[PDB]
Design a protein around this ligand. Structure first.
Ligand SMILES: *[C@H]1[C@H](O)[C@H](O)[C@@H](O)[C@@H]1CO
Ligand SMILES: [Zn+2]
Length: 773
């Protein structure tokens, strides 16, 4: 009787704000893409003639088709949000091209993976050769086809396309046939390969059709090794690839939702709970101040953020896009699950933190371009995509992000409206005969006004979110005072027979806070209200800040600044917090007026506004007592680590999917794993990469474990490396570096590196491959 609903994008008009800017910039980027290049893989796999070459980058190195899927979703949501005619022409054309591809094969299959029909013939026969990122020699093909399922779902739900609906059902029936001869054990083996959110999309088809066969399919596509610990409130996520898991959990939640009234299956509450526990553990233990998670795409231990503070590959944007999708699902029925009948605004505090500080920051606001990694290492920078060069996962999610800022501003519950986000907007609440405008300069000002533009004098309750970070309201010039009931996130209820012209005004008091890195190392970020602040540390060596189509072009490969050159805050955390002063002006800006080492007064602005520069979000802190020892470590060990990084020509992390894929991983009889938080690969046959040599290289460094008795032969362009390596002292965790001084410098270009056993059963387990000048 008390279900909470969301509004359609059609019903929520963004008014001038950073969000409308971001929407419009993404519109331009979406329209820049050539649909004939995005459709080319699909036509190819159907036996038709493409009209143009595919894009390059990931669209011709094995993930061919994935951006086309995202492109359907982004066009559909952007069309719902704007009604843009150019967007509709592109969406109609892409749907009709993919429909031609589907009809040419006639089975329901649509896809771009090279050799798609052969792949799925093998799978259907039970020839399943799964790795974490591969299936039968192909790059995450389940993940790829997921973006088509999702794209066709979105064309139906957002753009009302019946053609998309039929294409989606045919493609789902095709998968029923592919999996009809597979045991649950074979399915769970195949699901070891990254598969995006297929369980979610199959549950979506169940709801669209009302046919439970699609819910049985969704459950078959639910990865049990991940689900089962979550049911039991066990976080087993250390070392896992993070964006692989989040869509699975979204899927468990969606299966639970669509299964709410399924008399033949009794697990909905358990699967809902698994998702709510997953959210809790990631948000509360694995997330930084901007709302993101992971380092080099993987979950590190929650008690050790060292790599988050040292690596240039900070949180990945996809992961936050997916955590926000989950957040929206969990919030909707939070009141049903806790039998309060009011949803839990703690979900909204997270949503706001991640939306303003990560999603909004992840697009260059003027020109466009999407961020993959956001370093938390002080003094680095982030790289942006370009429309015709960049075909990354974070481009696909990037296209979607800025279409849909209207989706979570408000929620409705019969005669109740939840005012969740303080984003300028006009709402059509047709269910209660109301049109309302939210006017605010937030976060640059504290005042919010809600204006009733149209109403039918129903008694309605406005539930205004009072964030934990933030009671007098004004109605029509009259002050109404209410008692604070909790310092926690809560709602302030205001019920009236609203009429045209009524005005509700409230203020959100904003304070400076200082948020420590979660493992309580000596690094802190400044916030103002929910806004993460940052300082610009310079504009030198921003190499590849607008990416080309190269493998690895999503990473900020420019020079690493030694930490002793970046401002370090001297003193205790309360003194440091008190030393940040707000500057006068209509935009947020702050001066840091305490002691900084080395001296440059620092200016801080919102991180979402900091572009085309190096930055610090987290600052290293030093007590006056520990300064001498801290500075000596920064001047010696940290400086030397930075020098090694700055002599590095190429770098591979064996066992990490994207580093391996960017270096054209090949293998025979190989396995991967983790030891002491580091990934490896080893083989009984062999494994190989291509090294990309931008500058001549002199030295190869291989990281292994001292205790490993297995040895590798190394071939460079099929010539055995016979020079004797120098061997480093073992570190704390038992890792050593083998340093080979190459007999001849390696030429600029590409060089195969191949590892095969040297008399032993396996190669050494290799944890890092580094090429140096
Ligand atoms: C980016 C994102 O993490 C996706 O899940 C993955 O397939 C891609 C590269 O690893
Ligand atoms: Zn990504």
């Amino acid at each position: 009787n008390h279900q909470v609903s969301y509004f359609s994008l059609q019903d929520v008009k963004l008014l001038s704000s950073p969000f409308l800017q971001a929407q419009q910039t993404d519109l331009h980027y979406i329209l820049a893409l050539d649909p004939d290049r995005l459709s080319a893989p699909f036509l190819r796999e159907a036996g038709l003639t493409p009209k143009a070459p595919s894009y390059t980058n990931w669209e011709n190195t094995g993930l061919d088709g994935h951006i086309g899927g995202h492109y359907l979703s982004a066009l559909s949501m952007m069309y719902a949000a704007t009604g843009d005619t150019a967007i509709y022409h592109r969406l109609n054309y892409m749907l009709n091209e993919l429909h031609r591809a589907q009809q040419a094969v006639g089975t329901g299959f649509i896809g771009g993976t090279p050799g798609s029909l052969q792949l799925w013939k093998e799978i259907k026969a039970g020839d399943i050769r799964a790795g974490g990122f591969s299936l039968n020699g192909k790059w995450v093909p389940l993940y790829n086809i997921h973006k088509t399922y999702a794209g066709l779902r979105d064309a139906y739900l957002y753009a009302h396309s019946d053609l998309a609906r039929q294409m989606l059902i045919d493609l789902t029936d095709w998968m029923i046939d592919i999996t009809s001869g597979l045991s649950d054990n074979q399915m769970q083996d195949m699901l070891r390969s990254e598969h995006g959110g297929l369980n979610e999309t199959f549950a979506d088809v169940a709801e669209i059709t009302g046919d439970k066969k699609y819910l049985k399919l969704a459950r078959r596509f639910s990865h049990k090794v991940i689900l089962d610990p979550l049911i039991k409130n066990e976080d087993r996520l250390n070392g896992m690839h993070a964006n692989t898991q989040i869509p699975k959990v979204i899927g468990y939640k969606r299966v639970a939702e669509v299964s709410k009234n399924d008399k033949d299956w009794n697990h909905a509450a358990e699967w809902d709970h698994a998702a709510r526990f997953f959210w809790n553990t990631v948000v509360n233990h694995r997330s930084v101040c901007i709302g993101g998670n992971s380092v080099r795409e993987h979950f590190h231990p929650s008690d050790n953020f060292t790599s988050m503070l040292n690596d240039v590959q900070g949180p990945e944007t996809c992961n936050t896009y997916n955590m926000l999708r989950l957040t929206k699902m969990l919030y909707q029925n939070s009141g049903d699950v806790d039998n309060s009948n009011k949803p839990d605004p703690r979900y909204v505090d997270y949503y706001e933190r991640a939306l303003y500080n990560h999603i909004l920051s992840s697009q260059e606001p003027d020109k466009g371009g999407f961020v993959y990694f956001t370093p938390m290492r002080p003094g680095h920078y982030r790289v942006y995509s370009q429309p015709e060069t960049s075909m990354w996962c974070c481009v696909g999610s990037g296209l979607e992000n800025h279409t849909k800022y209207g989706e979570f501003i408000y929620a409705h519950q019969q005669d109740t409206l939840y005012v969740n986000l303080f984003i300028p907007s006009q709402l059509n609440w047709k269910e209660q005969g109301v049109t309302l405008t939210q006017e605010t300069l937030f976060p640059d000002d504290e005042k919010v006004t809600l204006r009733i533009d149209k109403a039918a004098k129903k008694n309605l309750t406005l539930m205004i979110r009072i964030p934990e970070w933030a009671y007098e309201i004004t109605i029509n010039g009259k002050k109404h005072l209410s008692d604070i009931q909790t310092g926690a996130s809560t709602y302030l209820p205001i019920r009236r027979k609203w009429k045209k012209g009524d005005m509700i005004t409230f203020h959100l008091p904003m304070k400076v806070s200082l948020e420590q890195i979660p493992d309580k190392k000596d690094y802190y970020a400044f916030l103002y209200g929910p806004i993460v602040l940052a300082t610009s540390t310079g504009t030198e060596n921003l190499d590849g800040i607008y990416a080309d189509d190269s493998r690895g072009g999503h990473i900020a490969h420019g020079r690493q600044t030694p930490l002793q050159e970046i401002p370090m805050l001297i003193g205790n955390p309360d003194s440091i917090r008190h030393s940040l002063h707000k500057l006068s002006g209509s935009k947020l800006a702050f001066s840091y007026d305490g002691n900084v080492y080395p001296t440059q007064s620092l200016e801080l602005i919102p991180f979402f506004r900091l572009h085309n520069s190096r930055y610090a979000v987290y600052f290293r802190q030093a007590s006056e007592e520990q300064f001498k020892t801290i500075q000596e470590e920064m001047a010696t060990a940290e400086r030397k680590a930075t020098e090694l990084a700055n002599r590095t020509v190429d770098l591979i992390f064996p066992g990490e999917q994207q580093p391996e894929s960017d270096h054209s991983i090949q293998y025979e009889a190989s396995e991967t794993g983790t030891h002491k938080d580091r990934h490896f690969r080893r083989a009984k046959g062999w494994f190989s990469y291509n090294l990309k040599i931008k500058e001549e290289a002199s030295q190869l460094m291989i990281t292994v474990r001292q205790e490993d008795r297995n040895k590798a032969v190394i071939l460079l362009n099929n010539e055995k490396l016979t020079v004797h390596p120098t061997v480093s002292k073992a570190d704390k965790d038992g890792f050593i570096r083998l340093c080979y001084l190459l007999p001849r410098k390696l030429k600029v270009g590409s060089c195969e590196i191949l590892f095969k056993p040297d008399g032993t059963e396996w190669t050494s387990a290799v944890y890092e491959v580094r090429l140096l000048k």
